Amino acid sequence: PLHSIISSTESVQGSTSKHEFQAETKKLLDIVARSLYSEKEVFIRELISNASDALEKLRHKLVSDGQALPEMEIHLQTNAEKGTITIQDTGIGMTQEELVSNLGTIARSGSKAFLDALQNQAEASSKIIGQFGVGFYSAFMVADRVEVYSRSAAPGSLGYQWLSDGSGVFEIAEASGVRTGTKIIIHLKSDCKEFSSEARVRDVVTKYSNFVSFPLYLNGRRMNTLQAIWMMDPKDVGEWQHEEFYRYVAQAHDKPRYTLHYKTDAPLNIRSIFYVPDMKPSVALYSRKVLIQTKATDILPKWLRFIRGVVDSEDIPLNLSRELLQESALIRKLRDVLQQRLIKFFIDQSKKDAEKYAKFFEDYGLFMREGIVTATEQEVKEDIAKLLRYESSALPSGQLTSLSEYASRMRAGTRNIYYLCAPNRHLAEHSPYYEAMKKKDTEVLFCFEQFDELTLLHLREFDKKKLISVETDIECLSEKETEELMAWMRNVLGSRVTNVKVTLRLDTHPAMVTVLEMGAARHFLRMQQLAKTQEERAQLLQPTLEINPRHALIKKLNQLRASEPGLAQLLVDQIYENAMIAAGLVDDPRAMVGRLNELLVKALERH
Amino acid sequence: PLHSIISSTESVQGSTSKHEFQAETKKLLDIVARSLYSEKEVFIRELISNASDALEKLRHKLVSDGQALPEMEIHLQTNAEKGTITIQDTGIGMTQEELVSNLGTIARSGSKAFLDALQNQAEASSKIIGQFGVGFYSAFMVADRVEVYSRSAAPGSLGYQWLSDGSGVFEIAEASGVRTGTKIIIHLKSDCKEFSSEARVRDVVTKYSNFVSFPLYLNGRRMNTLQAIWMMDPKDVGEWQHEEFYRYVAQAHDKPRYTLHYKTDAPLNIRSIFYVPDMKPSMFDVSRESVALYSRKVLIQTKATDILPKWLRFIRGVVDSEDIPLNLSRELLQESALIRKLRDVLQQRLIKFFIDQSKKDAEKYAKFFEDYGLFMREGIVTATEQEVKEDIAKLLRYESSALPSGQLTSLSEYASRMRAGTRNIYYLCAPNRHLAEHSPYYEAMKKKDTEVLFCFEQFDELTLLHLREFDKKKLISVETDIVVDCLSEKETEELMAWMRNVLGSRVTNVKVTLRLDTHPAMVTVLEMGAARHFLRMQQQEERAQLLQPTLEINPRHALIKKLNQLRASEPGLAQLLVDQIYENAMIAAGLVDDPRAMVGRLNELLVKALERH
Numbered sequence A: 001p002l003h004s005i006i007s008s009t010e011s012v013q014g015s016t017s018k019h020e021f022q023a024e025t026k027k028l029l030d031i032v033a034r035s036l037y038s039e040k041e042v043f044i045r046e047l048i049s050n051a052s053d054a055l056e057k058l059r060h061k062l063v064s065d066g067q068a069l070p071e072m073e074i075h076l077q078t079n080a081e082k083g084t085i086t087i088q089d090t091g092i093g094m095t096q097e098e099l100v101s102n103l104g105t106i107a108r109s110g111s112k113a114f115l116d117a118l119q120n121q122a123e124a125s126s127k128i129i130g131q132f133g134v135g136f137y138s139a140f141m142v143a144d145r146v147e148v149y150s151r152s153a154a155p156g157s158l159g160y161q162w163l164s165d166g167s168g169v170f171e172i173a174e175a176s177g178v179r180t181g182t183k184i185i186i187h188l189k190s191d192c193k194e195f196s197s198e199a200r201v202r203d204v205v206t207k208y209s210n211f212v213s214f215p216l217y218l219n220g221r222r223m224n225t226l227q228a229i230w231m232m233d234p235k236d237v238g239e240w241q242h243e244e245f246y247r248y249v250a251q252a253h254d255k256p257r258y259t260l261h262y263k264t265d266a267p268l269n270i271r272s273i274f275y276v277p278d279m280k281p282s283v284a285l286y287s288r289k290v291l292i293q294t295k296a297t298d299i300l301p302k303w304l305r306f307i308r309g310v311v312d313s314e315d316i317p318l319n320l321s322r323e324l325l326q327e328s329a330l331i332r333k334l335r336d337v338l339q340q341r342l343i344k345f346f347i348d349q350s351k352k353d354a355e356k357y358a359k360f361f362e363d364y365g366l367f368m369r370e371g372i373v374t375a376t377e378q379e380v381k382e383d384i385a386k387l388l389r390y391e392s393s394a395l396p397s398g399q400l401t402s403l404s405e406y407a408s409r410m411r412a413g414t415r416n417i418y419y420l421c422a423p424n425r426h427l428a429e430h431s432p433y434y435e436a437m438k439k440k441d442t443e444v445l446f447c448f449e450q451f452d453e454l455t456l457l458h459l460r461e462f463d464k465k466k467l468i469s470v471e472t473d474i475e476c477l478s479e480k481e482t483e484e485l486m487a488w489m490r491n492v493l494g495s496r497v498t499n500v501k502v503t504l505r506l507d508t509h510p511a512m513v514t515v516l517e518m519g520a521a522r523h524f525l526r527m528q529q530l531a532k533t534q535e536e537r538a539q540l541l542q543p544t545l546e547i548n549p550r551h552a553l554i555k556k557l558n559q560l561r562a563s564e565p566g567l568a569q570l571l572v573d574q575i576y577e578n579a580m581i582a583a584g585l586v587d588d589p590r591a592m593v594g595r596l597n598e599l600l601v602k603a604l605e606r607h
Numbered sequence B: 001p002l003h004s005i006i007s008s009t010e011s012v013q014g015s016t017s018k019h020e021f022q023a024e025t026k027k028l029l030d031i032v033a034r035s036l037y038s039e040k041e042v043f044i045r046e047l048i049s050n051a052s053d054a055l056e057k058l059r060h061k062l063v064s065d066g067q068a069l070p071e072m073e074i075h076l077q078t079n080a081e082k083g084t085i086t087i088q089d090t091g092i093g094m095t096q097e098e099l100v101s102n103l104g105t106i107a108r109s110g111s112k113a114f115l116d117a118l119q120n121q122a123e124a125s126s127k128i129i130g131q132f133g134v135g136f137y138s139a140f141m142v143a144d145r146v147e148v149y150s151r152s153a154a155p156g157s158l159g160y161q162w163l164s165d166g167s168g169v170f171e172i173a174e175a176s177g178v179r180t181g182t183k184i185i186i187h188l189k190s191d192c193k194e195f196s197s198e199a200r201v202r203d204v205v206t207k208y209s210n211f212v213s214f215p216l217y218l219n220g221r222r223m224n225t226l227q228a229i230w231m232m233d234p235k236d237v238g239e240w241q242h243e244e245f246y247r248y249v250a251q252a253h254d255k256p257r258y259t260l261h262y263k264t265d266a267p268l269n270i271r272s273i274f275y276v277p278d279m280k281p282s283m284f285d286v287s288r289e290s291v292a293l294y295s296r297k298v299l300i301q302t303k304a305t306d307i308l309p310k311w312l313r314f315i316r317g318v319v320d321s322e323d324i325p326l327n328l329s330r331e332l333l334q335e336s337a338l339i340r341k342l343r344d345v346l347q348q349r350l351i352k353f354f355i356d357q358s359k360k361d362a363e364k365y366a367k368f369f370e371d372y373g374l375f376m377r378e379g380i381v382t383a384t385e386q387e388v389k390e391d392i393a394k395l396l397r398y399e400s401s402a403l404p405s406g407q408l409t410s411l412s413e414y415a416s417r418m419r420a421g422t423r424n425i426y427y428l429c430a431p432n433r434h435l436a437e438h439s440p441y442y443e444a445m446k447k448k449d450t451e452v453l454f455c456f457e458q459f460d461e462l463t464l465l466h467l468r469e470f471d472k473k474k475l476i477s478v479e480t481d482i483v484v485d486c487l488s489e490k491e492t493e494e495l496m497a498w499m500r501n502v503l504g505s506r507v508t509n510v511k512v513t514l515r516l517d518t519h520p521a522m523v524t525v526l527e528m529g530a531a532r533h534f535l536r537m538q539q540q541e542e543r544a545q546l547l548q549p550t551l552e553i554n555p556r557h558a559l560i561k562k563l564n565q566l567r568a569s570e571p572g573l574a575q576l577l578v579d580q581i582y583e584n585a586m587i588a589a590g591l592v593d594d595p596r597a598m599v600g601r602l603n604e605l606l607v608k609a610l611e612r613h
């Protein structure tokens, strides 16, 4: 029964006091430097972001005041002997009260205040990175003492000094000889001395700060060399630049078969490039030219993970650890827009180049099939379904058709789409479920790839037309002499073959095999790898055999049945084997090799 | 062009100033309530954790003095019409001083102070959740008016008041009629009203706080129903209780075929339980892309970042660990040093567990291997350190020539019965033993006297190649060992050369092999395992230019002997038969991409091969 203690017999009989929220700083520093960032290496990323923000501030101030632009670069210095990493820029710089307000206060960012006083949102609002005010304190998880030397770019400002150890106290002083900008000296912790190595610093800078708007120098060498091609015009960027850019973001060496430069910003300011790898079997997320996460499996659907590239947006919501605010109230709109655009782009690619898209299909067909089954909204499934290509009975072999054009030639009277799932076209065209509708002039799609039977049930509908599985619907030998041959073949092949029938549509093949139970035909293929014992093969599927008397081999078996019964008994098994191979029910015909080899030696005994 | 601006020309001339770090409280509240927690529904998870911490504090206080323990419970009250959610517990409660110190201060946590005041670190140190002091302020993610009532459980405390809009200022007063324990009233935002429904609250509480240490009532519905069987001794929990918990974590209705209750404290404080489903793993589920962490009995939701090895994704369960470092948003510290050690420790235990399972019930493990063996094979190839490859290799089961059909052998015990000084493990790939016993490559090995393993399942050849050695013995395939190791001499030579004339575009070299007895021909490749890997998944004249199909013939075979007179008496038939002989070797090697092309030549061969009959 009901059991609750919630009640409203409670009132207020006190005096309304006025307390302002407090915040102890020791635990805040401990949280920032111990339990805020997943990886220890992001401190140089945050420092480079601060340097880039300072350089952007100086550039904006200079262009607003209308004078020359001096050298503005970020210099990373690493001294292995001293165990220190030094970052220095030529940004705006910071004064006494500026240092006290920005560096000495948690969550207080001067970048946000500068952005609020910009009132244009077009000059540098999309380039200022800092928004939280805790980025600098990420340097304390690697350093036992941080030395910051800054001097404002104002005409007359004096240099200052900033010492701290992360214990809630910082000793700011006065320094002379400070060059314009900010010079941050970091003395690494005993357990964090590995950041005093040039290799690690270069690796982290390439991982995070490879696309900084300003020159980045590590030990005196410029090492950015990547001008963020996702930010320029799609027509201005050449195709050759896309080749190495894909090799960088995807960490591959091949070429991209497709390249989509998406820049339309209806929901969010998106500057993204999407690549499709050539290697038949994961998009980098960026915010203001700073990497957020490499995998970024949240912005794109799981079935779209096969594409590579970059997605850059300056309006995405970021976590305090500068990572993606996954499953935010706003990110889901971006996922649908990206998903619809790629589907629209793929559809356009199919029309522009059918053969290229057809080749592209089997490389990543399992991804589209995965999308339909894992999709929740039915309308979403219809979008991916437009990307599917299938072979049709009314169209010759080797060419594929999509669902949309299949319904284009669909009869007006009928309302449902018929699809048949078979290992290959040859066996599909002979199944009795297929010619059941061949009496009428209907058209059926032939399904070949695996998991394709799985997705059609989940799709269950296309363009208001239901998908109906066909399975669930339900010169020549004399006639007299051919029949007596049929009875003999039903004795020697009694177990394997249910019945043998005459075929009038053969030119050079002595015999094929036909199945009644395509549901169990795939069972035969899956058991080829394991437990393909010949004796048990007959009971599993019970294959049916069809032959033509016009063939020479069939015409030869007439005399072989009596003159050489031993050779005939081995040849009829061999003819059955080739029928199995031609229809594709057997992947590797290793079993027939042993019997074929001994068949040939007595096939030439009189030569 | 190496230029740098870094120098040490700077010197200090002034006197250092004394300063302390500050903090913008309003901006801190904005950060916590807007850009701290990715998922907006974790606010009641944080508040339920706070209620559990308060209840644990009260229980510890009331057992320290050893008196009666009153009822302990957590109530989730939802009022859809008012658009409010109530979270009331019967914990210690808070006075005016505690309300101002804890609730009014960011990062100030009374649980951490209580933990440090324990002076024993043995009773409640492992079961207090709050450690940061910002968990409460997650309520401002959905609430524009947070209303908290609290009163300490001290003998003679009085109720109080707590109002805040998240604007950096909060109102505290005195309230009469307050019952013992903290009561929290949350007034939901206009855009966050979805938490004023029973279904959403039930879903999120099930998502995070099923295993709280106290009864949790959602509108009078006690919804724990699972007392965290991974806490008590492994022997205490029964088999039937394992199933009920397995249905929850795995979200499946089947039974677990294996159960590993792991509880260690030396490397890490781990209370983990692992289940292996008895159902056949879905071949679609394998293609698409495990365990759920618990820390102080709350779910962290870090299924990503493969905390468990990728090949171990087939097991379901929970890994409880009170020492893993959580970040502010209460998720994992991804790619940390400690979490990597957790993956290594868990991998060794799971590998050791399966080894013991194989030695316990070989028949049961044989069924287990044929179901989840693709994961072990996938793990070996994707492993980057050699040591773990042998650890997974002990889980592999193969059947060998020495043992009868249907009996599987491990790599370790196969290496136990080798010769005195043979540093070579021999394996052969074929769909079945019958097709492996009669394979020409195994026939050539009958000259030697060594035990050889048979590889039946798919991707098994690639697995041995990636392992490449086991127990300091190399893994040499049967095909590879051929290359590294009747008819008169005269007549064979022109037959030898003539085949090369007709198969110049297909075969590179053909040479005599006396090892073969009942096979007319055999084809050997240097990297046969790679060649089989090449042509199967990633995929005639163009194929031969890269594969180098070195064919071999057996002069003692009747068919090769028959090629003597057929090469001269019936020259037309000789070329066609050799093409069949050459193609037959490929099938024995499994290098045929599509045998549908060869049957047409095969069928028309039989027209003229026996046309005289």
Ligand SMILES: Nc1ncnc2c1ncn2[C@@H]1O[C@H](COP(=O)(O)OP(=O)(O)NP(=O)(O)O)[C@@H](O)[C@H]1O
Pocket (backbone or CB within 6 Å): A046, A049, A050, A051, A053, A054, A089, A091, A092, A093, A094, A102, A103, A108, A109, A110, A111, A112, A129, A130, A131, A132, A133, A134, A135, A136, A137, A181, A182
């Ligand atoms: N090298 C620098 N040069 C000039 N100003 C700086 C520099 N580093 C930091 N600052 C200032 O000090 C503030 C505090 O640093 P920081 O913690 O990075 O805040 P933020 O970068 O603006 N926000 P966040 O995204 O967390 O980094 C910044 O907002 C800047 O105003």
Ligand SMILES: Nc1ncnc2c1ncn2[C@@H]1O[C@H](COP(=O)(O)OP(=O)(O)NP(=O)(O)O)[C@@H](O)[C@H]1O
Pocket (backbone or CB within 6 Å): B046, B049, B050, B051, B053, B054, B089, B091, B092, B093, B094, B102, B103, B108, B109, B110, B111, B112, B129, B130, B131, B132, B133, B134, B135, B136, B137, B182
């Ligand atoms: N329902 C409650 N009953 C009693 N004390 C409470 C309650 N909620 C919060 N507190 C106290 O207020 C403090 C601040 O809350 P909170 O932000 O959750 O800190 P925390 O839980 O200890 N650390 P965290 O993991 O971030 O939640 C807690 O540490 C408790 O001391």
Ligand SMILES: [K+]
Pocket (backbone or CB within 6 Å): A102, A103, A104, A105, A106, A107, A108, A109, A133, A134, A135, A136
């Ligand atoms: K700051």
Ligand SMILES: [K+]
Pocket (backbone or CB within 6 Å): B102, B103, B104, B105, B106, B107, B108, B109, B133, B134, B135, B136
């Ligand atoms: K607090």
Ligand SMILES: [Mg+2]
Pocket (backbone or CB within 6 Å): A046, A047, A049, A050, A129, A130, A131, A135, A136
């Ligand atoms: Mg910053």
Ligand SMILES: [Mg+2]
Pocket (backbone or CB within 6 Å): B046, B047, B049, B050, B129, B130, B131, B135, B136
């Ligand atoms: Mg808490």
